[PDB]
DNA sequence: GGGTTTCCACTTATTCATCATTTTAG
DNA sequence: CCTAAAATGATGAATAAGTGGAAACC
């Protein structure tokens, strides 16, 4: 089941990463040692996307990240070749987006093998600045005078729904809400699906309402961090507008069995049968095995 | 063969995913 | 009164991003 090249890069935008490393080394003539490549780092528990994503591009390796953590890297240069043709026709709409083009850019430098010349560093430098972190503190000590262009911010808007549903396995939630009361059964049954995100990104976040027809976004906070959350809690909306959408465009990993799950408590909702009181139970024991119950 | 590339074990701060009670809407 | 929907209030950790060391390679 070879991922659909939407998919991945909705999954790549969620949780992909490019790296640019400029290594001190003594046996180098510039002084220095480069390294290019794509990576995505995931839970044990969806190492098989990472062996998916690898056999779909013929392109990659896979290594333990931890006990609790694997890790797709593509560092091989000519197999960078491979992640340059899906993004130029699949592109990324998120602000890596913009670290896809510096990521290009560095490629287009060491295929030249300019990074073995010294301009070739100073110029790697001057594009890995703005990548990702940017410079370490002791690469700015060792290139005072690196000037870099302005990075603009990107904004672009999502292209169709396999690219939602491949984000969607990255950053989305399916949740069981079981509000607690003094009533009849005692609690009403209330699915709900949330998308997180990045402040950095709300054009993409506020989109999304637009785009479902459906939700409303919240700003959320922690410490000095901020980011924003896409919530659907009306279930006609989840019934008719979100679930639809995902059965169309299957999600990967261990999500979709949440995401199946959830359409189950969808199912008895929708047949009234969460009033009732061994609907109820079936509910609740959906619940304790989805998610971090699973 | 020696500079360079590639792999592989390993680390880390926070943006995610996931959590649930309380309140309001209809 | 009864049920649905939203607002409120919360945090552990799977992420994104990075690093050390050296075998593989051309
Ligand atoms: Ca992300
Ligand atoms: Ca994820
Ligand atoms: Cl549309």
């Given at each position: 089941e070879s991922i659909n090249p939407w998919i991945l890069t909705g999954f790549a935008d969620a949780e992909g990463?490019?790296?640019?490393?400029?290594?001190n080394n003594n046996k180098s003539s510039v002084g220095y040692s480069t390294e290019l490549?794509?990576?995505?780092?995931?839970?044990?528990?969806?190492?098989?996307?990472?062996?998916?994503?690898?056999?779909?591009?013929?392109?990659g390796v896979i290594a333990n990240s931890g006990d609790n953590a694997v890790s797709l890297?593509?560092?091989?240069?000519?197999?960078?070749?491979?992640?340059?043709?899906?993004?130029?026709?699949?592109?990324?709409?998120?602000?890596?987006?913009?670290?896809?083009?510096?990521?290009?850019?560095?490629?287009?430098?060491?295929?030249?093998?300019?990074?073995?010349?010294?301009?070739?560093?100073?110029?790697?430098?001057?594009?890995?600045?703005?990548?990702?972190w940017g410079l370490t503190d002791e690469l700015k000590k060792a290139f005072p005078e690196n000037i870099?262009?302005?990075?603009?911010?990107?904004?672009?808007?999502?292209?169709?729904?396999?690219?939602?549903?491949?984000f969607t396995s990255g950053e989305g939630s399916f949740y069981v809400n079981l509000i607690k009361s003094k009533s009849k059964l005692g609690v009403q049954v209330q699915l709900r699906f949330d998308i997180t995100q990045h402040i950095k990104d709300k054009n993409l976040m506020n989109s999304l309402?637009?785009?479902?027809?459906?939700?409303?976004?919240?700003?959320?906070?922690?410490?000095?961090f901020s980011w924003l959350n896409f919530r659907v809690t009306k279930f006609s909306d989840i019934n008719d507008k979100i679930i639809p959408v995902f059965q169309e465009?299957?999600?990967?990993?261990?999500?979709?069995?949440?995401?199946?799950?959830?359409?189950?408590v969808a199912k008895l909702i929708e047949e009234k049968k969460h009033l009732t009181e061994s609907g109820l139970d079936e509910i609740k024991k959906i619940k304790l095995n989805m998610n971090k119950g699973r």
């Open positions: 990463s490019f790296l640019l490393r400029i290594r490549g794509f990576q995505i780092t995931l839970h044990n528990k969806d190492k098989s996307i990472l062996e998916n994503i690898q056999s779909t591009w013929k392109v890297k593509v560092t091989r240069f000519e197999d960078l070749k491979v992640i340059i043709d899906h993004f130029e026709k699949y592109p990324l709409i998120t602000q890596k987006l913009g670290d896809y083009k510096l990521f290009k850019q560095a490629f287009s430098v060491m295929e030249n093998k300019e990074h073995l010349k010294e301009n070739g560093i100073k110029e790697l430098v001057r594009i890995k600045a703005k990548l990702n870099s262009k302005e990075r603009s911010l990107i904004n672009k808007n999502i292209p169709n729904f396999k690219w939602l549903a491949g309402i637009t785009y479902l027809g459906c939700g409303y976004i919240i700003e959320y906070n922690k410490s000095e465009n299957t999600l990967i990993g261990v999500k979709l069995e949440d995401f199946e799950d959830w359409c189950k």
